[PDB]
Design a binder for this molecule. Sequence first.
Ligand SMILES: O=C(O)c1ccc(O)c(Cl)c1
Ligand SMILES: O=C(O)c1ccc(O)c(Cl)c1
Ligand SMILES: O=C(O)c1ccc(O)c(Cl)c1
Ligand SMILES: O=C(O)c1ccc(O)c(Cl)c1
Ligand SMILES: O=C(O)c1ccc(O)c(Cl)c1
Ligand SMILES: O=C(O)c1ccc(O)c(Cl)c1
Ligand SMILES: O=C(O)c1ccc(O)c(Cl)c1
Ligand SMILES: [Fe+3]
Ligand SMILES: [Fe+3]
Ligand SMILES: [Fe+3]
Ligand SMILES: [Fe+3]
Lengths: 233, 233, 233, 200, 200, 200, 200
Amino acid sequence: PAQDNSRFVIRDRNWHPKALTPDYKTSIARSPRQALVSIPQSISETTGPNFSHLGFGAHDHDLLLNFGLPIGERIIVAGRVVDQYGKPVPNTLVEMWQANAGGRYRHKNDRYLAPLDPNFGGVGRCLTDSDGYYSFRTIKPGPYPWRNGPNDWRPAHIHFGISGPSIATKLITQLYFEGDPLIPMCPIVKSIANPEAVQQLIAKLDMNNANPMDCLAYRFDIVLRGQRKTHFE
Amino acid sequence: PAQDNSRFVIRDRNWHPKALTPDYKTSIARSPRQALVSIPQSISETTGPNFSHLGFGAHDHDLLLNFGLPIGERIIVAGRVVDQYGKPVPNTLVEMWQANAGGRYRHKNDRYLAPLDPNFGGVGRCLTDSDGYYSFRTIKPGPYPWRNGPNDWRPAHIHFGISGPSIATKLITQLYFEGDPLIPMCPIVKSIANPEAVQQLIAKLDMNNANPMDCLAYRFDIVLRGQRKTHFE
Amino acid sequence: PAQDNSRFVIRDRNWHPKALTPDYKTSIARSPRQALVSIPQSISETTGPNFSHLGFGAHDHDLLLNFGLPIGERIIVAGRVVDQYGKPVPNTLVEMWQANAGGRYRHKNDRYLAPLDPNFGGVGRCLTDSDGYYSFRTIKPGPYPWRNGPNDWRPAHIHFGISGPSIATKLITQLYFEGDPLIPMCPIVKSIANPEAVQQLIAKLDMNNANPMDCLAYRFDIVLRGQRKTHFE
Amino acid sequence: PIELLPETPSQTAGPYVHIGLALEAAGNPTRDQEIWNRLAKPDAPGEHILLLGQVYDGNGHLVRDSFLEVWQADANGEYQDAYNLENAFNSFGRTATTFDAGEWTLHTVKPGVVNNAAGVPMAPHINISLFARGINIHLHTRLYFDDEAQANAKCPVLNLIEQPQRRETLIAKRCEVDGKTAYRFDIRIQGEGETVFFDF
Amino acid sequence: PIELLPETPSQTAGPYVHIGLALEAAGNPTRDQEIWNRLAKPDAPGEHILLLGQVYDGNGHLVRDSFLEVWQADANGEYQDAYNLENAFNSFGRTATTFDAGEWTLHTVKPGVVNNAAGVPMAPHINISLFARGINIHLHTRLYFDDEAQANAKCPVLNLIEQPQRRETLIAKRCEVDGKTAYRFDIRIQGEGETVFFDF
Amino acid sequence: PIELLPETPSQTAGPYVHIGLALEAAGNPTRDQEIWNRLAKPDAPGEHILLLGQVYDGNGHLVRDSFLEVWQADANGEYQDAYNLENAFNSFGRTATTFDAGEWTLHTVKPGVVNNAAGVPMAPHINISLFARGINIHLHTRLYFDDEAQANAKCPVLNLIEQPQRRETLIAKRCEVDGKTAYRFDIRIQGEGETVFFDF
Amino acid sequence: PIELLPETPSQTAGPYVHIGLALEAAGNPTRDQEIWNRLAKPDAPGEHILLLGQVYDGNGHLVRDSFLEVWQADANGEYQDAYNLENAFNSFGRTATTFDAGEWTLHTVKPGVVNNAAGVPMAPHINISLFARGINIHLHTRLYFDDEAQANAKCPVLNLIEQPQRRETLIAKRCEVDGKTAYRFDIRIQGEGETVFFDF
Ligand SMILES: O=C(O)c1ccc(O)c(Cl)c1
Ligand SMILES: O=C(O)c1ccc(O)c(Cl)c1
Ligand SMILES: O=C(O)c1ccc(O)c(Cl)c1
Ligand SMILES: O=C(O)c1ccc(O)c(Cl)c1
Ligand SMILES: O=C(O)c1ccc(O)c(Cl)c1
Ligand SMILES: O=C(O)c1ccc(O)c(Cl)c1
Ligand SMILES: O=C(O)c1ccc(O)c(Cl)c1
Ligand SMILES: [Fe+3]
Ligand SMILES: [Fe+3]
Ligand SMILES: [Fe+3]
Ligand SMILES: [Fe+3]
């Protein structure tokens, strides 16, 4: 079983979005009013699941084949998962979900008028390799309206889930695309008080990784909490 | 019949792209080597077709209905046509064509692997109103690879053609989308020596014109050669 | 035999000098008029010779002994060969040639009045080590007059040839010396449009590597096209 | 001071989290292997239990789109990190609340005692991470059992909560469902009886 | 100096121009009303003629993706600007070159004489605007008739072309097609016999 | 967008390239092992052939200081990258143009067929890189054989050249030298019948 | 993006709003024509009703200085935008809370049904704008009728409110005042039973 051998750099709660961010309407009723109770790290918090033995299907990471060809901009979304000390995070689980080219989600509750794409599911999973690299092949999602303010539109984005080495590292974020003008107007993006933090979520066009006459590529590196050995404990 | 009652401001050929712009490979063999011959404006040059009586279909300007619903980002592309003097250009013909959401054109010569959209044609036409306003309803086109350099990609764009009051004013151009990172990398865009000029081809996100929970809007104003009355001729 | 397992970042033809650079006289008649034809990479272009089994002489890389002692400034010229990704290029062929201290080449076609040095040849070769490092010991070449403009002089330079992992990476270039005033005046240097690219060709004085009371040293690193694994092809 | 690379910023899971993490829930076809709400196979050692709960917002309204992640020790108090559908017991699981009833379920075994860093035993507990639209950064909590009063009293973690009244918010209430041992653990995000959430 | 708003810069039509301006050519369904290559109906006054030509690049290779616009007076030397499919004659038309043969054709009447701004007569001519991939800004040219040599000689416009030899590049060669009066007007974008292009 | 370190910039090989890469040519003492123009040893399998040609500048003048590198598969269509003087066959060679005659020669075998990335067979060909004073960045080309018309017609590479007339520039003309099978491949850097140069 | 002129920013009306918009209330002489709380004249078609309510702050205290503006369709579901004291019915009115009791009143008719932009009928409702010191920007709300349960259930607007419990805050309770049909619509600016306020 798991061993309590590590300590994780404490999260910066001013870097991450606060719970209560009024402009994002839903945050009001869904944010605690009491302060979080800080607790020392124990085996309970410094361990987590290792997905090495999860039986992944052949196209788990290929949104182009995992559901005809979908309609939309063919892109590769790739990057590396590292910790705050810049150490690679190998064999870690990266999960993603997104809307189709029109901003329509293949989910019961999505009533947006953009039609579904018969050849698009919008789910992927990839286990980072030895070097913390992951890659997905998909179509760039379209922005979509949502019932926040009377004219709110989420920028095109991909939802990301990263496990990391423990439950303390586990994170859910969103990737945004370079130059998208919707970015600065989004109340959800704006839950993030520091502009520099916002930058970390923007995927950069990556011509170097594109397949000429095929698809473009975007680079999205992810940084998980720094992992250190315990000392003088 | 038409009458010679106007002069048009001479074109700035340093502003418009030059004929020979070697990075756009095709321009090499398709550009004159001899200097253009300047000629005074006559009725031949200062007149042109008036399309007021063209019989336009109900959805000539609605790319969502003029060919199911197409898959892609629903947008309205609207703006005004004015001359250099800032005067509206009424009842002028505006035509447009573009690829689908994946960068695929509905043309026999397009072999790009992204599929066609069964519900999308990619052609529109609109006659400017009394105030020089035009509008189209469509889906945001996808960038696409082309055989220039080994890894060339046209930024998402919409081809436009504008008649204006004369043959002297007729123009063919391309609309690019605000923040597209591909823009600066394009040899075609780069046929334009002056960055200021490039800016004029960038459609801006127009939230004021969007239909909440429906579609976004882009604003693209067009400026045709200023038209003046002849004097002391 | 070789296998097509890699792709090479597309060359930036605006970074490299163009073919037609009128100030470099010879380029006028030796540059194509037609555009290059872009072709996808295949085993033909992504492979190349490996010189690991070439039988190099003991002083192949020592111009001080490979031909008395030559007259001129004793210098070691060393550096590393890496790709655009910063990965070292091990076991790659680095070949160099240059003039003597007087700027005289040991070639029939050189009729410059500066004398030949009885103990100086001007040729070196070195296979890079496991870390992509190479080194040469030679005398610093002198500038030389050439028939271009009426008073043209090549800055002191050493010619380099590097193989790299494929014919796609193979490159010929020239090393220049930090602070040389002729640099900015050379039409050959000037074939390079970007000042920043020029900087890449300047060997920097490296006191750390000099042999006290013996010889000085220059550091000259080389970056070849980034090499990546094929993906979703 | 020394500054490391900043950790990528969190973002709400959104309403459609199911599409990525709870396929069956999103009303979508699942893949061969899915990480779900059945941590233990019938033949797994320990006391087999059922966990269930509802998540309420600051208005006392059900949060029908919540996503939950669990991490617990086996019956021996051992954390089994090597996740495999073949295993009899997995330390990790996922669940979500029904869009109708708004209740999640988990099929597991009662965790064994685990010691903290200082060597003091913690009361049996299940670590929970709560995700949902409106939640910018996931909420961490712990589920303790009302039938471990003795152990709960000495929990070094439970004891870190200043106000005893708030400790009660983390105690799941034992019941029976179809003659089976169950525990109900409701989470109140905000207000009256607001559940304790941790930072670590 | 006084500076006005700058004109929107031109950009090449690209290889798919047909989709927007030559539907039939793109091999796509057309709309009720299309602006095409038949300027005159059978019952239009004037001498009915057929225009045809090929467009050549710098290498002497056919430009098969070219798009052309034309503007001419009617047989009475009048410019009919009110475009209408109902009209016997339209002063404006569109044509394109075949993807196969690479030849464009136009059905019209020989234009009457029009005076320049100074009140001097210009020889019968057709105003042409050439568009295609590789052409950043459209080329302007004029088509004159070989059978109007007297008029041609006095053309105030033709006369602006310094070199007599270049003037020849603008003269259409009268021929017969199915015993129909035709004129061949080949455009040579670059090199030997490079067609004179105008700026105005 | 993501930027990598920039590739070191090319520079012309200059007129004295021979001193570093064609010692014999520079009229200087060669070393024990030299990379030269004999890819095949007599006993190398495949059809032994002699390659020869001239290089012309834009004025139609011989380029007597050119330096060429060649890469080709063996008779079996295999790339032999492990360069060794002991090899019966080496996939890589070097040659240069005589300062007198201005002609280069190479001794090799006719290359076997190799498939492109898409799995389509390419016609037999030799990859060439041309270097010389006046050439800022080496030119890339391919040498195809006139006696493989069938194969040439299907080359996915050769088919990428738009104008069929340009494709001819890549075809070497079979001949005989002292009753030995030869192929002449002349390169026209610029102008009339300018050789096709690639970018990859 | 495109940015228009920014709208003039709102400011609280302050405690003396009455002097400007409710003269009588301020204890000041009124002018010839005043916009007040009597939308309908006795001879106006429709069901004559009396509306009354109280305004509560977050502490459960009456807001005795509130100012309200109403907009409603007539009995025929039509908006009478041409304001005139001579009219039997005006779609617009003004009211204010008494400094004593803190209750506002309005004399009108139950509005007819109107359709939303998508052509769906909305339940009969009165549009209310609330102003007062402490309120930086006026609060928008709608008053619905408890005796229009059926219509209410289907209102596309009422339906936009996620929580059904919240919908109830918009429903005025039918009552009788001196044997006359009245509806009580209390507004809770904050806390328990806080009234739904809109943005449009
Ligand atoms: O982060 C905040 O703004 C916050 C947190 C807790 C709390 O009770 C209040 Cl009123 C505000
Ligand atoms: O614009 C140019 O660069 C241009 C124009 C004409 C011409 O003959 C040449 Cl060589 C260049
Ligand atoms: O790079 C150049 O300037 C260039 C390239 C090709 C060509 O035909 C001409 Cl005229 C110029
Ligand atoms: O309604 C929400 O909170 C909502 C909708 C869409 C979306 O992508 C996100 Cl992250 C949130
Ligand atoms: O090949 C070309 O010239 C080409 C291709 C695509 C495109 O959009 C344009 Cl404008 C030109
Ligand atoms: O004449 C030339 O082109 C020349 C002469 C010397 C030299 O070093 C170079 Cl690179 C070129
Ligand atoms: O008490 C208040 O809120 C108050 C008093 C005066 C005044 O002008 C305003 Cl706007 C507000
Ligand atoms: Fe989303
Ligand atoms: Fe295009
Ligand atoms: Fe030199
Ligand atoms: Fe005041």
